[PDB]
């Protein structure tokens, strides 16, 4: 009964571990040992977004690589023009306890969720001229920690009820709910093809789900603490998970195991945000130590530090063309780096 | 600079609006409600009028209080408790009719984000506590309480047990007793909030 099922689960876990070990022929460090390093990547703050008044908890780039939406717990989701530091929109929120935001790839919609257990979709292109809440997606039992736009109609949300859900912004209903995480799912990343995605939970595990069939494909473990940020490799064949154990890790879909760990002894704060570059050569990770460190994603060595924030950096993100890095922080400033 | 002048004008307009909104929001006094399940948070928030976060706001003697009940968040507190780092005080409500709350008070009082914020501790159900003591001795929940079996001393012992969790000299625990049939909760909150405001303003000016 229960004993037999537990024994079967242990046997299956051991088989998975053995199969992952068999696929391990060499590490990423050994293979990328021969290639030349990137040197010192010295990035300088080009712009500073001095609009918000509270902790900035999320910041998502537009698909045009120029517009950016920033969510702070001041009750505002201000849309930014990075080229001129102009405020293009300022959206008041029903609940000031917002801890995620998304920008639609089409540019028409902005999502904003948080402790209210509701993912709110805002229409930027309303004919009346002002921004209005086109939808208020509800149904998560726990706080919504992430939300990403597949298109103008679908959206995937990551919540604190240990479940991720796929929605339809028209019907306002959960098209598909993904279950299997045993802790708060604090992060989410969608694949470039938007047919697969990964979630970073507080059970020190990351799971890859299929949007269409709505089932977990692979479970990735190796972290010693809650994962706070996850991000796909631009090739879509790998992802990086930044946790509170002060280590980022790189996981491969096909190898089904971790390849490199981005850990330094001098660093003890946990990672709040992870993001790759356009080429995937740099892994820019934000830290609770008030600074963002640039990592050589292939040689697992620091390429530079994005120091300049007076508080913990809560969100990082590079543009689609890779021309800039935006790093929001709890000091109520978003800084563009280049 | 053809219509980018007008874009800059719009940006300045909504920056001014953001400044005005932030100034208006700074006037309110943010309070955080915490406690055990059915420990009296609902009772106090309902006796003063007005499953995610349940914000409650009112005005008491020219102060706009904002009570954030977070009892519906049945998740890991460590992932969202940092959102309330700027609250004026943490209102803690304890039901004396029922150790389950002592650990939570210790966790929330030694939290790295709550080392400066004063905690207001409410010990509700005083009359129910007296009835329970009459029914059965109070040593059941506190076996180490080798003392008299009287409500007057039991309340003081429980208050001391709860307050012993304070370790930071910069934060003060205001403990109050309530019988769930009194209108004095608002006045106690107001007194503690005025004291906390004075202390925080003095500390910010460096004089404290």
């Amino acid at each position: 009964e229960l004993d037999q099922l537990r024994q079967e689960a242990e046997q299956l876990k051991n088989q998975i571990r053995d199969a992952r070990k068999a696929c391990a022929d060499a590490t990423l460090s050994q293979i990328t040992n021969n290639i030349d390093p990137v040197g010192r990547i010295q990035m300088r703050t080009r712009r500073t977004l001095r609009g918000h008044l509270a902790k900035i908890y999320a910041m998502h780039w537009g698909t045009d690589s120029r517009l950016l939406v920033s969510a702070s717990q001041d009750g505002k989701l201000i849309i930014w023009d990075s080229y001129t530091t102009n405020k293009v929109h300022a959206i008041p929120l029903r609940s000031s306890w917002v801890m995620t935001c998304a920008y639609a790839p089409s540019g028409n919609y902005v999502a904003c969720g948080g402790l209210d257990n509701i993912c709110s979709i805002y229409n930027l292109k309303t004919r009346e001229g002002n921004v209005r809440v086109s939808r208020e997606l509800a149904g998560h039992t726990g706080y919504l920690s992430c939300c990403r736009f597949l298109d103008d109609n679908q959206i995937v949300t990551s919540s604190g009820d240990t479940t991720c859900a796929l929605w339809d912004i028209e019907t306002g209903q959960q098209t598909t709910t993904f279950t299997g995480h045993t802790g708060d799912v604090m992060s989410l990343s969608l694949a470039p093809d938007t047919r697969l995605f990964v979630s970073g939970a507080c059970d020190a595990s990351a799971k890859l789900w299929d949007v269409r069939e709505g089932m977990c494909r692979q479970t990735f473990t190796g972290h010693e603490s809650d994962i706070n940020a996850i991000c796909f490799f631009p090739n879509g064949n790998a992802f990086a998970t930044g946790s509170d154990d002060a280590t980022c890790r790189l996981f491969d879909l096909r190898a089904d195991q971790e390849l490199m760990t981005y850990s330094h002894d001098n660093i003890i704060c946990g990672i709040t945000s992870v993001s790759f570059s356009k080429s995937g050569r740099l892994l820019l990770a934000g830290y609770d130590d008030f600074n963002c460190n640039v990592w050589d994603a292939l040689k697992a060595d620091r390429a530079g530090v994005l120091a300049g924030h007076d508080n913990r950096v809560s969100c990082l993100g590079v543009t689609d063309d890779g021309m800039a890095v935006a790093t929001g922080s709890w000091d109520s400033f978003l800084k563009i780096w280049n | 600079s053809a219509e980018e002048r007008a874009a800059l004008e719009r940006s300045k307009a909504i920056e001014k609006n953001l400044k005005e909104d932030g100034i208006s929001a700074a006037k309110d006094v943010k309070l955080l409600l915490l406690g055990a399940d059915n420990s009296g948070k609902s009772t106090i928030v309902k006796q003063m009028k007005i499953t995610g976060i349940v914000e409650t706001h009112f005005t008491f003697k020219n102060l706009h209080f904002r009570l954030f009940d977070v009892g519906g968040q049945r998740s890991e507190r460590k992932k969202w408790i940092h959102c309330f780092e700027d609250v004026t005080a943490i209102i803690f409500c304890v039901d004396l009719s029922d150790h389950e709350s002592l650990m939570l008070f210790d966790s929330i009082c030694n939290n790295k984000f709550f080392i400066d914020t004063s905690i207001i501790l409410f010990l509700n159900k005083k009359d129910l506590f007296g009835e329970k003591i009459k029914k059965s001795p109070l040593t059941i929940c506190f076996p180490e309480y080798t003392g008299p079996n009287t409500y007057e001393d039991a309340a003081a012992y429980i208050q001391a047990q709860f307050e012993s969790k304070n370790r930071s000299p910069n934060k003060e625990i205001y403990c109050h007793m309530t019988c769930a049939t009194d209108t004095n909760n608002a006045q106690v909150i107001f007194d503690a909030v005025t004291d906390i405001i004075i202390a925080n303003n003095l500390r910010g000016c460096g004089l404290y």
Epitope: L67, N86, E128, G129 | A7
Partner: single-chain antibody, 230 residues
């Protein structure tokens, strides 16, 4: 939904005054910069006045400056010292300017008032064009200055005025299509040569097409191309 109904038209003796009122509804009028555009009974559109959001900046035309003043959800054009050249059908135009916005998108129905140098002049060589449905037509517009700003935006706006109807924005910034305008419309150009291309012409598309610049005030209009049906 969105509507700009405006009144204050009629016969005025020369030298008189009249305050035209534009009533706006169905949209956040407080956050829209309001324009005023007039058509003489036989001539084409002419820019009259512009008032920004929050009344911060107001611009006037060369023939309008001093005489007219532009000032809930109501737009006023205080118009004084009326001359015989002021007679026209004044339109109410809404336009909000942010990154990627669509200025001049909505036009009021317009009210008729009868009175008994450095500008970027836009010239449309073809005053009229005979055309049959189902083919591809083209309308051209020129300019005195290059409209391509250093930030990469050209500021040519294409407007379609159906006979007996208010102008409708078709193409803003010389490349972008307005919402609701069918994909059969396309616009292209560079600096000085601008060409509006219409594919699979329809019966409703017949009208007069107006070319406007937005690089600098005053907002000079084109002479208009009457794409008359043949």
């Amino acid at each position: 939904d969105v509507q700009l109904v405006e009144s204050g038209g009629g016969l005025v003796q020369p030298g008189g005054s009249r305050k035209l009122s534009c009533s706006a509804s169905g949209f956040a009028f407080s956050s829209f910069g309001m324009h005023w555009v007039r058509q003489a009974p036989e001539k084409g559109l002419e820019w009259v006045a512009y008032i920004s959001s929050g009344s911060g900046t107001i611009y006037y035309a060369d023939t309008v400056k001093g005489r007219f003043t532009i000032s809930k959800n109501t737009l006023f054009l205080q118009m004084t010292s009326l001359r015989s050249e002021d007679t026209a059908m004044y339109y109410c135009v809404r336009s909000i300017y942010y990154y990627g916005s669509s200025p001049f998108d909505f036009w009021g129905q317009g009210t008729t008032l009868t009175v008994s140098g450095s500008d970027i002049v836009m010239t449309q060589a073809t005053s009229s064009v005979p055309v049959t449905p189902g083919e591809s037509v083209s309308i051209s517009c020129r300019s005195s200055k290059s409209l391509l700003h250093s930030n990469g935006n050209t500021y040519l706006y294409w407007f379609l005025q159906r006979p007996g109807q208010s102008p409708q924005l078709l193409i803003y910034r010389m490349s972008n299509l307005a919402s609701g305008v069918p994909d059969r419309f396309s616009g292209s150009g560079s600096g000085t040569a601008f060409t509006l291309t219409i594919s699979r012409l329809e019966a409703e598309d017949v009208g007069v097409y107006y070319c406007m610049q937005h690089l600098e005030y005053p907002l000079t209009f084109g002479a208009g191309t009457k794409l008359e049906l043949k």
